[PDB]
Design a binder for this molecule. Sequence first.
Ligand SMILES: [Ca+2]
Ligand SMILES: [Ca+2]
Length: 529
Amino acid sequence: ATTTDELAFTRPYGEQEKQILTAEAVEFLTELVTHFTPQRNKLLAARIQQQQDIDNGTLPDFISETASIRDADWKIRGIPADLEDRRVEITGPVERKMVINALNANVKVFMADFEDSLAPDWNKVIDGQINLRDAVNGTISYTNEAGKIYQLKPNPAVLICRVRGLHLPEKHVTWRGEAIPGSLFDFALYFFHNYQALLAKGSGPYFYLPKTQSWQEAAWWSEVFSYAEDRFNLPRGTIKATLLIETLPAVFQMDEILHALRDHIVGLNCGRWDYIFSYIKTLKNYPDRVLPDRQAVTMDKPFLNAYSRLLIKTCHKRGAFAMGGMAAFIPSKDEEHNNQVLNKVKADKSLEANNGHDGTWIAHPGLADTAMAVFNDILGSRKNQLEVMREQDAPITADQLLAPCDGERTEEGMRANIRVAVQYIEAWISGNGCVPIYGLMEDAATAEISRTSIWQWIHHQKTLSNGKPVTKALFRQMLGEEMKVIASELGEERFSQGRFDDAARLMEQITTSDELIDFLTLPGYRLLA
Ligand SMILES: [Ca+2]
Ligand SMILES: [Ca+2]
């Protein structure tokens, strides 16, 4: 085999690729890939070894050797001015119109997403980079079929780019015959095309990093960032990252993650769906760790509240932000439904603010004013809650973080999981990873917890609360039944115009396999061009 330090490209070099994959951009991307891919692959291999040790009966806990880091005083390098107030952030797709609408929402920050809310078609990743570049440059515009123009308002929200996670390939660009890391593709191009303009306007190249499992993974990101900074003669810490704590292994390494990424990190986030998905994957072989209906596994449950409290305390100890979770409701024409939704949003955001979270997430601009009002009210004149140390809290232990919550495993819950996951998958395979389903803007994590919970119940041969043993055969029976429900809900036209048979097949494949696959996006990505 050759010792090449060059990349190969599988798609035609058309007008879009000519904009984004310029000679200079490709040179830089090549350098990152050859310098950092081997270590990235070693990190993926380390994941396997760590998981095996957990499977083999040793539960995760804090790291003994790094005690001196945790029990020392130190803080992150710093937070730039435009990241000191992040009380509400909106998330969404890198599609052109959606970028404009999000930047125009009444929020502090827009996280443009190449990750869970994107089905990573080549055209969509390339268009996404085009869109974000136009957004940074302030020229982004869109005119719809009806002739209505969309443009940026004055003072749009601060832009942050969420990259694909460490496990994901970008199959259309290869090094030594293997797909390069999507993480490097997404990071390299957003940074390269935008760092100059961002810095010139008083902002900076900002990233969201998903699905981290270890401090060593944080260290690798720090090296990537430092490499990028050095290459363009930027001072250390110019690139700023916010890092989701949304895997079980990561909750035991928050302080080490902050330390490893100290030059660049500005905050951590709580999640729900990815976290409990990870809980099940991590504890997959443990008969005493079966979670009930994921619908009932709410953030106020003891293990999730402990997670929340530990994350806030840890972040504030180090001067980093501690971001709360997602309210993904989509307002409807039903004002009564809307009142109930807004009451729920108010209750949930108030819980987060009262706990000390510096900010929170929404998926739809229609929730901005409500979420903002909760945080405005509780913050008073403060920009954030960095001073809230939670020093009154008792220590938080591994036992507490690992304790499965009370609840029932219900047939209604199982059926709903099937309907939501199938409809999510149908859209994803059709190129849409940000999917309105039953009044919620769903991303891949929802499909993940849905399939993973069912897998868990099958694996450990658990009964539903009505006494029915959960089996592959029961699942398959229910799948067929729920497909008919979906058909009735959507109507014959939409159902026939869709990819529901292909979606049901992928669902069955990922749910009924003996081995619990890590991510549905891996087999799913095979279905994309
Ligand atoms: Ca081993
Ligand atoms: Ca997530």
